[PDB]
Amino acid sequence: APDTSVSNKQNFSTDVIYQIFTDRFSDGNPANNPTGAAFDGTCTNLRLYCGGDWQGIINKINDGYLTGMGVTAIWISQPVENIYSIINDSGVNNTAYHGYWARDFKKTNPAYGTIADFQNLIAAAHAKNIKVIIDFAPNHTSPASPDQPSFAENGRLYDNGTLLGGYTNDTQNLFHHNGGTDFSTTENGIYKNLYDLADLNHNNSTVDVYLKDAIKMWLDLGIDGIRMDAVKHMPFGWQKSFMAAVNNYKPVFTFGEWFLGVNEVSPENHKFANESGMSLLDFRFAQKVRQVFRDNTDNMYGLKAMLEGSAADYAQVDDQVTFIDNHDMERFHASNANRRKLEQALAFTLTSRGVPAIYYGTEQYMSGGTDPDNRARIPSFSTSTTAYQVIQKLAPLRKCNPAIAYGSTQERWINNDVLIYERKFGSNVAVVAVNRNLNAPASISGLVTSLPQGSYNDVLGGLLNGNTLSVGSGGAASNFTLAAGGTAVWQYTAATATPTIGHVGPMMAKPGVTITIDGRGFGSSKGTVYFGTTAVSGADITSWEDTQIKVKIPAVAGGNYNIKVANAAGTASNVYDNFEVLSGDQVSVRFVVNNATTALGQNVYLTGSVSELGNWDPAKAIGPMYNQVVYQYPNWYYDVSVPAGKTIEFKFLKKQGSTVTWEGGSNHTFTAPSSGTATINVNWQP
Ligand SMILES: OC[C@H]1O[C@H](O[C@H]2[C@H](O)[C@@H](O)[C@@H](O[C@H]3[C@H](O)[C@@H](O)[C@@H](O[C@H]4[C@H](O)[C@@H](O)[C@@H](O[C@H]5[C@H](O)[C@@H](O)[C@H](O)O[C@@H]5CO)O[C@@H]4CO)O[C@@H]3CO)O[C@@H]2CO)[C@H](O)[C@@H](O)[C@@H]1O
Ligand SMILES: OC[C@H]1O[C@H](O[C@H]2[C@H](O)[C@@H](O)[C@@H](O[C@H]3[C@H](O)[C@@H](O)[C@@H](O)O[C@@H]3CO)O[C@@H]2CO)[C@H](O)[C@@H](O)[C@@H]1O
Ligand SMILES: OC[C@H]1O[C@H](O[C@H]2[C@H](O)[C@@H](O)[C@@H](O)O[C@@H]2CO)[C@H](O)[C@@H](O)[C@@H]1O
Ligand SMILES: [Ca+2]
Ligand SMILES: [Ca+2]
């Protein structure tokens, strides 16, 4: 099938995600509605169940609400069974309507529906070319008190009805008992409780295996993608091993949530997205968009800096999931603000690089403060809104104009309030003009583009006061006036002749796994696929077409490879880097080195004989290691993803900048478990 097919679980770049709070969307089956003080059909009390369910979602798919909008994917709340207890906070009754308080990852939340309702959801969706994404929060269970075991469900964890354990009397050590995080450090927010949520111990084989098995069930249920909750709160090493479990089984688009604040730029964030085997929700993008379009705390020069910076920081920028708001922030639209602010932000998001995500209700100009004011019930299903028509006109461009889905981004004109960018991919072009100034028009002159000679109509049809564009020779555009609050989209599409790689997924897996290569101009006849210098052809290429190729990963040594294709004629394409080949199936192992004294600013890293350890390359060493929570300096620790059952040689190193100090003596050795976890405790060798 084509790259734009609904069957494409590896690529969402051409889609438009619609984030749905199940409970707050549509109650299609009143029979499964929670009763008593846990329910509020009037949805006046936003901390209780309102009745939203999967059936309701199906109804909205079948009636044309979502399809008419141009939405090609839906991201729903966590489907797993949540606690049934009504948590009373200082007089405020609280329920697990959000689905974030898991009690059993192998069962569904009855309020949402049964397993059969879920299966029906997948079918109905797929039938309308809509992909299904599920929220997955394996960082914790529920709110618990080690003190008062009577509080909530004591964060109890069940395995398909079978009680595994609780936060109180945790003899098995399923959870972390390190207190609560203050978000002070990364390590602090990782090994300590997120709020009062019972923190899961991923270093426990039981938890490790259980979680990896739970997801496999969902995978089997036909999901097309996963949104990983609180990724900055779980060990990176375990998550990688988790991604490998998914990838080496049934690959699906996965993106996690790594909360970033205003003007917050984390290098840890970048590394995670680049090496974890999963992408992230673009918090850098969302925050900046809000500054520029919402609060006006930054200008177009800031938006531009964000675009060009992110493009350099993310190996796969096109994989980052963009948004303007969500269930954890104030809704973009302020009740007293000009709607044109939201419309423009929408238009910008839909035409920018990455994977656009729209928080349900946006199209309806919903306003609301922080949680839970931002999670009100959708007030209507009207298609007559401007924001609705905007998405409806721009959404589809992601499927018909590859420049928007995989294209580069280039600034072609800029000032405080105006921004004109160009998206380009192969013989495809898209030019977007935005004027955030709602009071003053802008005189556009000297604009140059990649558009062919001719006249271009505004894709938005003037909806946002857009205009036509006249392009002469050299793509030089005729002088024009950009109206206040004006937004215009111009484009040009044409068949690509040369093989052009626009996307790859999964980005990490072991040999034998089938990956997906999307782009243009691959030809209809099988060509050759290159993993570094290794050529692949014939049978291993399970599928080949102009826009998509399906090939199995060759049995090459573990490492980082550049992907490249060639058509039947021998014409090579562009390179697609950062593709990681695993040494095999993965396990999560905790490494511990004792008596490793360092100087302030100097950290300890881990290196080893496997690609998962950097193959003895200090530039690729694991770390910096931790030394606060679980173990304390001069004791360091770190959870790493390593090939299972493999006998690995390793050493530790002290690094300051690029300067390296090796551990003395001989290499440490050990055989990775074939399953579950392990803990390697060693002493620094002088
Ligand atoms: O802001 C967070 C912080 O976290 C990480 O810091 C790393 C360091 O980069 C690593 O070096 C390591 O730190 C170790 C030191 O290596 C080790 O020597 C020891 O440090 C002692 C010092 O010996 C002592 O002099 C004391 O220094 C003073 C400073 O002189 C003063 O300027 C400052 O105001 O206060 C300190 C505290 O008195 O500091 C400690 C006292 O025990 O112990 C630490 C381990 O804690 O590991 C940490 C991670 O925990 C990031 O790498 C770093 O960039 C970031 O700044
Ligand atoms: O050239 C191939 C070489 O590769 C591998 O050697 C690695 C060592 O096993 C490993 O210990 C590490 O060596 C460092 C020492 O530990 C340290 O004391 C000091 O001597 O620096 C060394 C790094 O230069 O890294 C090397 C790889 O560079 C393999 O195991 C060897 O058999 C082989 O000779
Ligand atoms: O003419 C090419 C030129 O176009 C753009 O420059 C704009 C600039 O952004 C405006 O602020 C204003 O000064 O008009 C210029 C047109 O002359 C691009 O920004 C620039 O890179 C490019 O060279
Ligand atoms: Ca219901
Ligand atoms: Ca945690």
Same domain? 156 vs 287? yes
Q: Which residues are paired to 590 by β-bridges?
A: 639, 679
CA distance 111 to 49: 8
Q: How far is CA 110 from CA 30, 41, 123, 439, 652, in A?
A: 12, 16, 19, 51, 49
CA distance 596 to 606: 12
Structural domain ending residue among the three candidates 470, 495, 520: 495
Collect residues with CB below 5 Å from ion ligand 5. 139, 199, 233
664 CA: nearest ligand 2 atom: 18
CATH code (residue 433): 2.60.40.1180
**188 Cβ closer than 6 Å to some ligand 1 atom:** no
**616 Cβ closer than 6 Å to some ligand 2 atom:** yes
Instruction: Note if 257 is an active site residue.
Output: yes
Same domain? 178 vs 79? yes
CB distance 366 to 379 below 8 Å: yes
Nearest CA among 64, 53, 49, 59 for reference residue 29: 53
Side chain identity, residue 534: T
Structural domain ending residue among the three candidates 465, 495, 525: 495
Cβ neighbors of 428 (< 8 A, separation 6 or more) are 401, 402, 403, 407, 491, 492, 493, 494, 496, 520
Same domain? 154 vs 135? yes
Compute the half-sphere exposure of residue 673: CA atoms within 13 Å on the CB side of its CA: 18
DSSP letter assigned to residue 11: -
Write down the experimental method used for this entry.
X-ray
Instruction: Note if 153 is an active site residue.
Output: no
Same domain? 446 vs 571? no
Structural domain ending residue among the three candidates 495, 515, 534: 495
Mutation test of ligand 2: which of 605, 662, 663 has the most ligand atoms closer than 8 Å to its C-beta? 662
**267 Cβ closer than 6 Å to some ligand 1 atom:** no
Same domain? 536 vs 672? no
Cβ neighbors of 542 (< 8 A, separation 6 or more) are 514, 550, 551, 552
Same domain? 491 vs 523? no
Structure tokens at 532: 């570094």
Same domain? 515 vs 647? no
Same domain? 562 vs 626? no
Q: How far is CA 421 from CA 308, 350, 369, 412, 474, in A?
A: 11, 13, 32, 5, 17
CB distance 4 to 72 below 8 Å: no
Number of domains in the chain: 4
H, E, C per residue of 544-592: ECCCEEEEECCCCCCEEEEEEEECCCCCECCCEEEEEECCCCEEEEEEE
Same domain? 361 vs 477? no
602 CA: nearest ligand 1 atom: 11
Q: Quick one: resolution in A?
A: 2.4
Q: Which of 23, 199, 257, 518 is catalytic?
A: 257
H/E segment holding residue 482: strand 480-482
Same domain? 602 vs 531? no
Query: Phi then psi for 38, rounded to 5 degrees?
Result: -95, -5
Q: Please state whether the peptide bond connecting residue 686 to the residue before it is cis, i.e. omega within 30 degrees of 0.
A: no
What number of other Cβ atoms are within 10 A of residue 164's Cβ? 16
Q: Please state whether the peptide bond connecting residue 624 to the residue before it is cis, i.e. omega within 30 degrees of 0.
A: yes
CA distance 103 to 214: 12
Which ligand sits closest to the CA of 185?
A: 1
Query: Phi then psi for 290, rounded to 5 degrees?
Result: -70, -35
Same domain? 216 vs 238? yes
Residue whose CA is at the smallest distance from ligand 1 atom 55 = 601
Nearest CA among 59, 63, 46, 57 for reference residue 18: 57
CA distance 673 to 10: 30
Q: How far is CA 579 from CA 224, 276, 504, 558, in A?
A: 21, 12, 8, 11
411 CA: nearest ligand 3 atom: 19
The dihedral region occupied by 21, where left means phi > 0, alpha psi between -120 and 50, and beta the remainder, is beta
Domain interval for residue 562 = 496-582
Q: Which of 23, 229, 343, 580 is catalytic?
A: 229
Same domain? 310 vs 218? yes
- How many whole angstroms from 562 Cα to the centroid of ligand 2? 26
CATH code (residue 640): 2.60.40.10
Mutation test of ligand 1: which of 183, 266, 600 has the most ligand atoms closer than 8 Å to its C-beta? 600
**413 Cβ closer than 6 Å to some ligand 3 atom:** yes
Nearest CA among 282, 281, 302 for reference residue 292: 302
Residue whose CA is at the smallest distance from ligand 1 atom 20 = 600
